[PDB]
Design a protein around this ligand. Structure first.
Ligand SMILES: [Ca+2]
Length: 223
């Protein structure tokens, strides 16, 4: 997160870190046994780390649980990043509490102008590299479909939306991928892509979660 703020420990209780020896992507806990993340975050050997603030210190609220199964969206295209969504089942159910909690799925899509909370352990510089140890947050609005498409000609599908600031300086970044965009208490996006980070006229692009709720629910029901 570029241009954000320190969230506070366990104030984003659905935020997870995906770990393969090191943090490499975020994710969102959607029930005791399932995480949603970005398909471009897929790898084997994932440990899901819940209840994290400092990803380099054991602080006392962590739950570390191996993935038992990963499911990349059937229509994920890694070239275009269309359908940049994947589900991860945990080998055991998380113990839900005040600091480890699921986030609601949307019942309807969000609109342009809605403020959202984006979070992650990604890069904090736009012309540099600095990775935080503690969770960073950004409040950002959803941008209109027309401004999103104008920012990124020929690249925005109906499964993507833009959020952030066309002026630059405030965005998600490398290492935030897969993490949440929550608007009025609903998971509306997944950190997906963008040109650089926090660049003028190049807002963040997010997977449009509301298009996938049917798939999510049926997949959970059968796995
Ligand atoms: Ca920790």
């Amino acid at each position: 997160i570029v241009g954000g703020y320190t969230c506070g420990a366990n104030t984003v209780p659905y935020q997870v870190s995906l770990n393969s020896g090191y943090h490499f992507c975020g994710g969102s806990l959607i029930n005791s046994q399932w995480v949603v993340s970005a398909a471009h975050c897929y790898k084997s050997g994932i440990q899901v780390r819940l209840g994290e603030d400092n990803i380099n210190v054991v602080e006392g609220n962590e739950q570390f649980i191996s993935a038992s199964k990963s499911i990349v969206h059937p229509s994920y295209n890694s070239n275009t990043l269309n359908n940049d969504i994947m589900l991860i089942k945990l080998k055991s159910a998380a113990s839900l509490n005040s600091r480890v909690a699921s986030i609601s799925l949307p019942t309807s899509c969000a609109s342009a102008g809605t403020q959202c909370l984006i979070s992650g352990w990604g890069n904090t510089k736009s012309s540099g590299t600095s990775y935080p140890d503690v969770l960073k947050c950004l409040k950002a609005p959803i941008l209109s479909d027309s401004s999103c498409k104008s920012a990124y000609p020929g690249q925005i599908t109906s499964n993507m939306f833009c959020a952030g600031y066309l002026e630059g300086g405030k965005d998600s970044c490398q290492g935030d991928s897969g993490g949440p965009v929550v608007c009025s208490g609903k998971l509306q996006g997944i950190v997906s892509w963008g040109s650089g980070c926090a660049q003028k006229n190049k807002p963040g692009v997010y997977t449009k979660v509301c298009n996938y709720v049917s798939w999510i629910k049926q997949t959970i029901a059968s796995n």
